[PDB]
């Protein structure tokens, strides 16, 4: 069972928890990073309104501009997940 | 000198070329992926108006929603670069 480590968040605690749950579901169902990212993005578009963006991977850096209170960057096990709405 | 391979683009040829030039400049100046991404994002915010987002790395998948004609995904050498405006 994969360890969640939230690295940077500008997001309600309830939503941070959902992101972690959603990513857990995604990793259960899918093995390919883009499919994992697509599942998370789509769940959040639904649960929390569009428009979300998701990057999933083991090696990347980013510079994104996000809407306040709609950004999370976390690890689920060995995989890093960036999920946010654009600012 | 690093080989540019554009993998997916919804973007004018002039802008695709600028993205490749910008990423080339970034890789000359910086070694860390987030710094490379920040340099590209900032150049495009300036040259082509906000709001851009940039991910740079060797291992990641993504699902993002972009504005039509403002998306490029390419490699510069071994590094993958995702650059886009949000749709």
């Amino acid at each position: 069972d994969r360890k969640a480590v939230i690295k940077n968040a500008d997001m309600s605690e309830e939503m941070q928890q959902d992101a972690v749950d959603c990513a857990t579901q995604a990793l259960e169902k899918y093995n390919i990073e883009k499919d994992i990212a697509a599942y998370i993005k789509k769940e959040f578009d639904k649960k929390y309104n569009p428009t979300w963006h998701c990057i999933v991977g083991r090696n990347f850096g980013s510079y994104v501009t996000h809407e306040t209170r709609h950004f999370i960057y976390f690890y689920l096990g060995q995989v890093a997940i960036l999920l946010f709405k654009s600012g | 000198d690093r080989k540019a391979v554009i993998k997916n683009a919804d973007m004018s040829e002039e802008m695709q070329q600028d993205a490749v030039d910008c990423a080339t400049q970034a890789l000359e100046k910086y070694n860390i992926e987030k710094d490379i991404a920040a340099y590209i994002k900032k150049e495009f915010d300036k040259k082509y108006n906000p709001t851009w987002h940039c991910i740079v790395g060797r291992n990641f998948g993504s699902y993002v929603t972009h504005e039509t004609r403002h998306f490029i995904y390419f490699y510069l050498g071994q590094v993958a670069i995702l650059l886009f405006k949000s749709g």
Partner: peptide, 9 residues
Amino acid sequence: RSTTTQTDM
């Protein structure tokens, strides 16, 4: 706001 992320690996 704009922020950076960088993977540990």
